[PDB]
Amino acid sequence: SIVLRVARLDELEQVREILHRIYYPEEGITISYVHGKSHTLDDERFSLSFVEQGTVVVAEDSAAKKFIGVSIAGPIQPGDPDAMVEEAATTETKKWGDILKLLALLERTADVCGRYGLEKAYHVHILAVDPTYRGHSLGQRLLQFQMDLSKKLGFKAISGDFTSVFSVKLAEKLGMECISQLALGDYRDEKGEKLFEPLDVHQVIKTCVKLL
């Protein structure tokens, strides 16, 4: 059977692998990028920085000693978008800087903390399930685990940027209201540049949120 739990720091490399295998190759934002679909090292560093914070949840096939799902979340709070823009100005790759600006825009537009009267919120950055492990409620169990965990940790709200139809469906199912959205192909940075071209046109990102 399948175990859900928080990833340990000593498991950073396994987290890295699952991200390489099932997340990046499919993530709408990363693969729709105009100058190359591959993820960069600074992207990876961002995602893995959460393992030490104890907010990376993995779904593990204990019988195969193998990760088969992962969810990465962290706190967000007023000020974060501006800090992200600053980080974008200094990061190693242009791709990660551009993505960081997009994420910042998503967060700024959603304004979860301001809309709900919070000092901070818990934000799911990544939710990824190996698609060959169907029929086990994996996506729902990962998201629910993140909800339960953030609750215990004292968070008053949880949110996420959901890039796929499934994932939005889960969010809605588990009581999250989509409060903001952004058509990916319509995105333009401050230069006026179109940076994302989802092979699936009319691909939309939805920021959803729920009080805990």
Automatic annotation (TrEMBL):
UniProt keyword Acyltransferase present = yes
The record's EC number reads: 2.3.1.87
Family membership noted in the UniProt record:
Belongs to the acetyltransferase family. AANAT subfamily.
The protein here is known as aralkylamine N-acetyltransferase
Q: What general EC class does the enzyme of this chain belong to? A: transferase
Describe the location of the N-acetyltransferase domain by residue ranges.
2-198
What pairs make up the disulfide bonds? Answer: C178-C208
InterPro entries in alphabetical order: Acyl_CoA_acyltransferase (IPR016181), GNAT_dom (IPR000182)
Query: Its annotated pathway?
Result: Aromatic compound metabolism; melatonin biosynthesis; melatonin from serotonin: step 1/2
Which terms in the Gene Ontology molecular function aspect does this entry carry? aralkylamine N-acetyltransferase activity
The answer to whether the entry has keyword Transferase is: yes
Q: Which UniProt keywords apply?
A: Acyltransferase, Transferase
According to UniProt, the reaction catalysed is:
serotonin + hexadecanoyl-CoA = N-hexadecanoyl-serotonin + CoA + H(+); serotonin + acetyl-CoA = N-acetylserotonin + CoA + H(+); dopamine + (9Z)-octadecenoyl-CoA = N-(9Z-octadecanoyl)-dopamine + CoA + H(+); serotonin + (5Z,8Z,11Z,14Z)-eicosatetraenoyl-CoA = N-[(5Z,8Z,11Z,14Z)-eicosatetraenoyl]-serotonin + CoA + H(+)
